């Protein structure tokens, strides 16, 4: 994947982990504004290997790592649908689940018939059992280093998002933690792009000078 703006001479490719440093505060703030306004503004563009423009729905932009909720309505919907598909791939297990649900429905139905008030029921479904169990991704994160790892896991799980972008998220992690994040990104194959106001020493990064010239580093 490649990103292109009017400041660059040629579009630079983003593969696996990528660190982009902008030495101009105006170009950095205007670039983040172009990231949040990407749907509104046509200046900033992104061309994949197919050389096709992507909608903002396919771009995942995350600034605050701790403030980003892992559990969402769409994420829980895709997770519950995934578990329902996994249970549907095995006929015998789903048959046993239908038998147990039939037994529980028979017991609760008998208790309802024992009551003096009329009771009407419909049925119990596997999706209602998963939602009743509260299946969700683990919400336990001790540090931002683990939270960003969970963000990379959910990002690699989401097929619709073709790119994940972090804005000034590298200032929290130590150099060694940055090395572990880059190695985990290379192992996960996902495309991650970082935007930093200042350069980081010891790691390979693309430095954008105030002259607008882009140069590789390490």
């Amino acid at each position: 994947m490649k990103i292109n703006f009017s400041l660059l001479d040629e579009p630079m490719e983003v593969n696996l982990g990528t660190v982009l440093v902008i030495e101009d505060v105006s170009v950095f703030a205007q670039l983040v504004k172009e990231f949040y306004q990407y749907d509104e503004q046509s200046n900033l563009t992104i061309f994949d290997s197919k050389i096709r423009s992507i909608r903002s729905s396919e771009l995942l932009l995350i600034t605050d790592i701790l403030g980003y909720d892992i559990n969402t309505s769409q994420v829980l919907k895709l997770l519950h649908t995934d578990i329902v598909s996994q249970l549907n791939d095995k006929p015998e297990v789903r048959s046993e689940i239908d038998s147990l649900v039939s037994l529980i429905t028979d017991i609760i139905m008998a208790e309802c018939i024992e009551n003096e008030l009329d009771i009407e029921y419909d049925e119990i479904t596997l999706l209602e059992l998963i939602k009743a169990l509260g299946v969700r991704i683990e919400t336990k994160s001790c540090t931002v280093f683990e939270k960003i790892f969970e963000i990379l896991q959910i990002f690699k799980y989401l097929v619709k998002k073709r790119i994940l972008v972090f804005v000034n998220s590298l200032s929290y992690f130590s150099k060694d933690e940055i090395y572990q994040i880059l190695e985990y990104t290379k192992l996960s194959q996902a495309d991650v792009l970082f935007l930093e106001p200042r350069q980081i020493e010891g790691i390979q990064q693309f430095i954008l000078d105030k002259d607008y010239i882009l140069m590789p580093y390490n």
């Binding site: 683990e146 790892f149 933690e177 572990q180 985990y184 192992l187 996960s188």
Partner: protein
Amino acid sequence: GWRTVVVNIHSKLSYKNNHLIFRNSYKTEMIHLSEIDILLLETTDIVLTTMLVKRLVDENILVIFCDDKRLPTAFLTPYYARHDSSLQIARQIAWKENVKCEVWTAIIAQKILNQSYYLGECSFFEKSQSIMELYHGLERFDPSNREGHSARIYFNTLFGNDFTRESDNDINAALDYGYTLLLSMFAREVVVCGCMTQIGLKHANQFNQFNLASDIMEPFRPIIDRIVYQNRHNNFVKIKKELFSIFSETYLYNGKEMYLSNIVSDYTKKVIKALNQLGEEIPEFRI
């Protein structure tokens, strides 16, 4: 590394921040990569990631896969920076015939001694005294065949004179089942040692592929015949249920009371180290 990580339960494995993440339904455990030495997977329900496999290739740790029978099937072979076990197999190819005959004779002596001692616990003095006489009469190269002669006395004492190993019965199938479980455990220990199980201690018969582990598991064999003697009236399913409790039951090692897995592990390690060092000490196990 030092600790040997073995997974007997359903679980998933991941690699994050130089940390192996093992996730099971009960709890999640994170283990440092430098602490792990050998990795073994007991069951077929374990899930692993190719990234963790690559990290294991960089860490040189040996990956062992097993089938539903728990017998080790395949192992991970890296193209570079190979593990030291592959260098240790050459010593197994260099094992001398004198050391193999000494360890084999010691193993047969331990098994026969355990059979006679078990017959003494069953309060048959004549049969246990005969098996003990055959134990004191055992010699190298086995010209007397006192092991095959002690067999018929042991089985005839246990299950009666009418019973035999050749006949088809739930008792013989139970004995083959217990020998299959013990062969799986000892074979897993030999696979952990890295030595090829196709090379046996017995020089006569190479037919079996498990010959090394089958020869190492002989001193622990009578412990199965005891439970098979107590439960002999029960159906083969009940005999399998009783034989399945041997993993939970604890036995007395010479040093201390231990589980069967640790005892078989220490015995196998002493056997391999003794074979490579040419008979420093022979591990002895008594019921």
